[PDB]
Each structure stands twice: as structure tokens, then as C-alpha cells.
């Protein structure tokens, strides 16, 4: 009856930038998703491919908690088939998504007067990010023909831009922490079940 340590994911004191989103494996465990779904802290609980009411009924081989911090106006980019600068460039979900997305406002945790520049996002990369891919590489984005030897300038923009997370920003610009539960079941025995 070892309950799943969702506290180390949802209640973590320091989340990760959306480009370098953390991924925690959950298995050898029992997880009650009804507590998360019936929690008032979460502003968004969008389940794709499954239904949250039946989450405790099903079992999967393992769960992946993909934790990051995005902008409010940007939370709608964590749905399957969405496009933009987070979905296409930072964290892509396949249209055949079997999981859930859990977004809660975290202004009082990840904002700072003057800007919480500790959170970043990837404006620049060659191709759209493959679903469930992350790229932590900070390589100068050559947008032009001329190789410029890795100096930040025209057609050599730094690929990562910072998030301006101030407590006075409008809700669409406030830091929302997002945890994506990706559910995987296969020939390996279903190990993470729900009460």
C-alpha cells in the first residue's frame, strides 16, 4: 500500500524550465489520481486518451511525471495536436496521447520582483520537437547562411529566452507549473495501479 510519492513532483520546491523539463518515473507503487483530480490547487486537469474518473480503475506499466513551468497563456500548448512555441519547440505531446496534464498557478512560488529569470524556454531550433523529446543543448541558432562561430548576433540568436515572471504580471503571463502524467502500458506487467 505504498502510496506514490507525488509530493516530490507536484509539491517540489524547484520545478524545471520547460525546455529542460524534468521526467520522473513512477512504478513499484500505487497512485491515487482521484486525490489530485479532487484537489482545489490544480486549475487545469485535462486528461487525453483516458477519463479522470476511471483513472483509479486502470493500471499501466509505468507513469512519467513530466514537470516544468510555463506561462499561463501557454498552458493550452500542452494538449495533443497543439502548435506554437512550447508544443512545437519545447515539449510536444503526440496526438495519440494517453495521459493527463495538470497545471496550477504558481505566482507565489516562482515569481520574483525584477523577474524570475531562472526559467527559460526554447524560441529557436531547426525542426519541431518530436513528441516526448527534450533538448537541453544551448547551441547558438544559426538562422542565416553565414557560420558566425557561436557569437550571439544577427542570425545567431541564443536559442533560449528567459521567462519574465513578475508577481504583477497578468494571469496569462504568470508562472504556471505543469505536470504531465504520461501513462505507458505494454507487455511488461502493469506495476502502477490505482486504489
Amino acid at each position: 500500500t505504498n502510496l506514490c510519492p507525488f509530493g516530490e513532483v507536484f509539491n517540489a520546491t524547484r520545478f524545471a524550465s520547460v525546455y529542460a523539463w524534468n521526467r520522473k518515473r513512477i512504478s513499484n507503487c500505487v497512485a491515487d489520481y482521484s486525490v489530485l483530480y479532487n484537489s482545489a490547487s490544480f486549475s487545469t486537469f485535462k486528461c487525453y486518451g483516458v477519463s479522470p474518473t476511471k483513472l483509479n480503475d486502470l493500471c499501466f506499466t509505468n507513469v512519467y511525471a513530466d514537470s516544468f513551468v510555463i506561462r499561463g497563456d501557454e498552458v493550452r500548448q500542452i494538449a495533443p495536436g497543439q502548435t506554437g512555441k512550447i508544443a512545437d519547440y519545447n515539449y510536444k505531446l503526440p496526438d495519440d496521447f494517453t495521459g493527463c496534464v495538470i497545471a496550477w498557478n504558481s505566482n507565489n512560488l516562482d515569481s520574483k520582483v525584477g523577474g524570475n529569470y531562472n526559467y527559460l524556454y526554447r524560441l529557436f531550433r531547426k525542426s519541431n520537437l518530436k513528441p516526448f523529446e527534450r533538448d537541453i543543448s544551448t547551441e547558438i541558432y544559426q538562422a542565416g547562411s553565414t557560420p558566425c562561430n557561436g557569437v550571439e548576433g544577427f542570425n545567431c540568436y541564443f536559442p533560449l529566452q528567459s521567462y519574465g515572471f513578475q508577481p504583477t504580471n497578468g494571469v496569462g503571463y504568470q508562472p504556471y507549473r505543469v505536470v504531465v502524467l504520461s501513462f505507458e502500458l505494454l507487455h511488461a506487467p502493469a506495476t502502477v495501479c490505482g486504489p
Epitope: 502548435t83 506554437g84 512555441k85 529557436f124 548576433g153
Partner: antibody, heavy 126, light 109 residues
Framework: VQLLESGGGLVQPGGSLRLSCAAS????????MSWVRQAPGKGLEWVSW????????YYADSVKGRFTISRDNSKNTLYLQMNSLRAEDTAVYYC????????????????????WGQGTLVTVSS | VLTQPPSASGTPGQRVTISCSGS????????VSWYQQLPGTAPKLLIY???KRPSGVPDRFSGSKSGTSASLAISGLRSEDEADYYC???????????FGGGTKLTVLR
């Protein structure tokens, strides 16, 4: 999307002052910014261009050294310190948003000078 | 320098070609842009790529960069089409967003 310039007025020759461009309606950190000069009844003369403070700042050949561009993404403002001003610089300064990002879904002025502010007017005269 | 005609013109309803030309560093290897500055107003970007056009601009404002010469084609002139049309392109050598001379488009009334 709107860019509002402030700081245009009387300038003594060789003087110093500060154009402040408040940018609203877009994520200020994602787009490059630039200043463009326009002498009264003359063409557009590019002043300067910036994307990041720690990166490379680009300046016109005629203003290298006497101009300094900077950003403040916390305030969503673009600042231009002009010092040791010379006579030909009496003009109208436009604060122009130069997009550089490409979202691969709908291109939005990916390499042009997308939106121009109302522009202030600087008179370098005693 | 984007060498551009000083004042092109045409009758309303005509298709006027404003063709500017710089160098390989000026315009051949960089994306040209076309801006329309009406008298007393800030310029409006009509063309951002060598060919592409931003939304909110009439479809008649076509752009086409062949080699080193960029053409802004304005088809169906009207009383709102008279303005200074600048072409601007980044310089790989001089490191400056060099604008054109400024074509003064006027309608033949």
C-alpha cells in the same frame, strides 16, 4: 501591439539624453528591437538593433560609439542613450520591433521590422 | 546601399513595380522587407520575407526578390496607396539594416 516612445525634445549640440520605448501587446523578450532614424523630410536611416543585452549590439556606421541601445524585459522597455549628439541627428526616432522567431505554424514578420511606434522627435540645436 | 528609385508613379488601377537593388551582402543573401510610410505616420511593414506578406495587408502588395533586385508590386493603386515605399535588408558585411533610398509613389490623377 503598441510601442510608445518618450524623450524627444530640445537637445543642445553635444548633449545627452535617453529615448524610452514602452512596448506592450507582445512578449517583449522574444522579438529583437531596433531604433530607426528619419530626418525631417528624408528617408529612413537605421539607428541600431539589439536582441539580448549580453549579446552583440549593432549600430549604424555614423553612430558607432556615441549611441548605446539597451533592453529592460522586466519593464518591457527599449532604451537608447544618445550622447555627444551631432547636428545631422535632428530627426524622428521610431522604435521598431524586429521579429526573429519562427513558430513553424504561421510566420509573423520573421525577419522584417514588424511594428513601428509613433516615434518621437529629437532636435539637436542650441 | 539598397539603390532604390527616388519617385515611382502610376495611374490608379495600374500595377507599379518598385525595384531596389543593393549587393550580395545587402540583399542577395538576406531577407528584404518593404515598408509603406504614409505622410506623417509611422511606416507599415508590407513585406517581411523576400516574397511573404504579413496578415492585415492587402493581397495586391506582392514582393519578389530575384538575385540582388527586390521588386514590390502594388496592383490597383488608390488614394490610400500614395506613400514612401522603403526596402530594407540586413548587411552581412557592414552589419547594419540598410534601408532603400525611399520610393515616393504617387498616383496619376
Amino acid at each position: 501591439v503598441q510601442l510608445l516612445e518618450s524623450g524627444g525634445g530640445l537637445v543642445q549640440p553635444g548633449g545627452s539624453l535617453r529615448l524610452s520605448c514602452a512596448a506592450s501587446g507582445f512578449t517583449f523578450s522574444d522579438y529583437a528591437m531596433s531604433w530607426v532614424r528619419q530626418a525631417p523630410g528624408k528617408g529612413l536611416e537605421w539607428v541600431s538593433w539589439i536582441y539580448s543585452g549580453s549579446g552583440n549590439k549593432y549600430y549604424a556606421d555614423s553612430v558607432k560609439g556615441r549611441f548605446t541601445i539597451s533592453r529592460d524585459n522586466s519593464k518591457n522597455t527599449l532604451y537608447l542613450q544618445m550622447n555627444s549628439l551631432r547636428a545631422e541627428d535632428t530627426a524622428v526616432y521610431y522604435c521598431a520591433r524586429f521579429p526573429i522567431a519562427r513558430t513553424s505554424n504561421s510566420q509573423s514578420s520573421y525577419d522584417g521590422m514588424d511594428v513601428w511606434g509613433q516615434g518621437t522627435l529629437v532636435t539637436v540645436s542650441s | 546601399v539598397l539603390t532604390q528609385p527616388p519617385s515611382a508613379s502610376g495611374t490608379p488601377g495600374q500595377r507599379v513595380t518598385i525595384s531596389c537593388s543593393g549587393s550580395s551582402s545587402n540583399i542577395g543573401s538576406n531577407a528584404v522587407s518593404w515598408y509603406q510610410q504614409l505622410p506623417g505616420t509611422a511606416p507599415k511593414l508590407l513585406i517581411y520575407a523576400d516574397n511573404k506578406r504579413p496578415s492585415g495587408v492587402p493581397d495586391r502588395f506582392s514582393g519578389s526578390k530575384s538575385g540582388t533586385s527586390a521588386s514590390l508590386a502594388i496592383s490597383g493603386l488608390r488614394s490610400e496607396d500614395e506613400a514612401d515605399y522603403y526596402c530594407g535588408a540586413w548587411d552581412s558585411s557592414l552589419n547594419a539594416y540598410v534601408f532603400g533610398g525611399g520610393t515616393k509613389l504617387t498616383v496619376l490623377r
